[PDB]
Symmetry: C2
């Protein structure tokens, strides 16, 4: 089933990352200056993209880790897309708690296509086993990192976080990446 992950990786890039990454640093500037709390840390640059290989994508991040808490939204990006006037691209800023205190602030979300690889394995008519799914989850991440390696839109404004669950802390996995910068 090689082609499934390949197509979803190209779709994620073409349909989302190449569209929102060019305007992301500008949107974070705007938030930092005009909407961020005077007394709090600037939102970090770069979109943090969670890639659970078990494809467990909760809709609420706080369900993954209590130490990951919704703070605010960036200014919305809108554009005409395929006959939709003002299609909305929205992103969410999280606080990452270390010892019940804020250790960092970033734009953070899951790669939605993985929620879709999950659903596809659950639907009989899709013909996609749960074995197929760990494999295609890996291929999706690889394909996406190859694409971004050559992408002119990734000018260091995007960070992939791939991880496997065997006590594992997501907030710690994000802070580990966030602190490399």
């Amino acid at each position: 089933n090689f082609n499934v992950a390949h197509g979803l990786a190209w779709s994620y890039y073409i349909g989302y990352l190449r569209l929102i990454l060019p305007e992301l640093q500008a949107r974070i500037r705007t938030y930092n200056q005009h909407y961020n709390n005077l007394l709090r840390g600037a939102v970090s640059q770069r979109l943090y993209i969670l890639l659970p290989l078990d494809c467990g994508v909760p809709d609420n991040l706080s369900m993954a880790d209590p130490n990951i808490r919704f703070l605010d939204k960036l200014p919305q990006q809108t554009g005409d897309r395929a006959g939709i006037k003002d299609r909305v691209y929205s992103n969410s800023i999280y606080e990452l708690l270390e010892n019940g205190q804020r250790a960092g602030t970033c734009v953070l979300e899951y790669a939605t296509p993985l929620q879709t690889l999950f659903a596809m394995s659950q639907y009989s008519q899709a013909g996609f086993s749960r074995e197929d799914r760990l494999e295609q989850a890996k291929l999706f991440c690889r394909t996406l990192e190859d694409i971004l390696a050559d992408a002119p839109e990734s000018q260091n404004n995007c960070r992939l976080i791939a991880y496997q669950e065997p006590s594992f802390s997501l907030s710690q996995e994000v802070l580990r990446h966030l602190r490399q910068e």
Copy 2:
């Protein structure tokens, strides 16, 4: 490359159609009663989905046909999705002109995944020829009509319009479907 279209069809269903179709008749009710012009035709039920097999998806429908004109937006649907608080699902209402007069009003848009099959054929690193693309465009449409055939969310609130360009009128192709109901 069978698996490319298959995955994008399942993604379109899981990631969009199964989420927005259940709440679509309610959203059209609301528009008809509270926002539609007193003196104009009700917006038709059902989401009209354009499926050009040449995968030519302009962002503005008026570029496909001057007789297809943006009228208004439905009320926005929002929900937490994969760590995005209040991700926005937006749809656009078009007037279909026959003889410079309104012959019909419907929620109308292109299947975005086809814009993506187009882009994929244009990018060297995707490894996807323009021959592959007409084939995968056909498979996408088939896979999608099989999915919807069994879908509990498609309770006759969704209409696929597949078409090939060889004078062809899109507004006439939409009015032909719209008038079957």
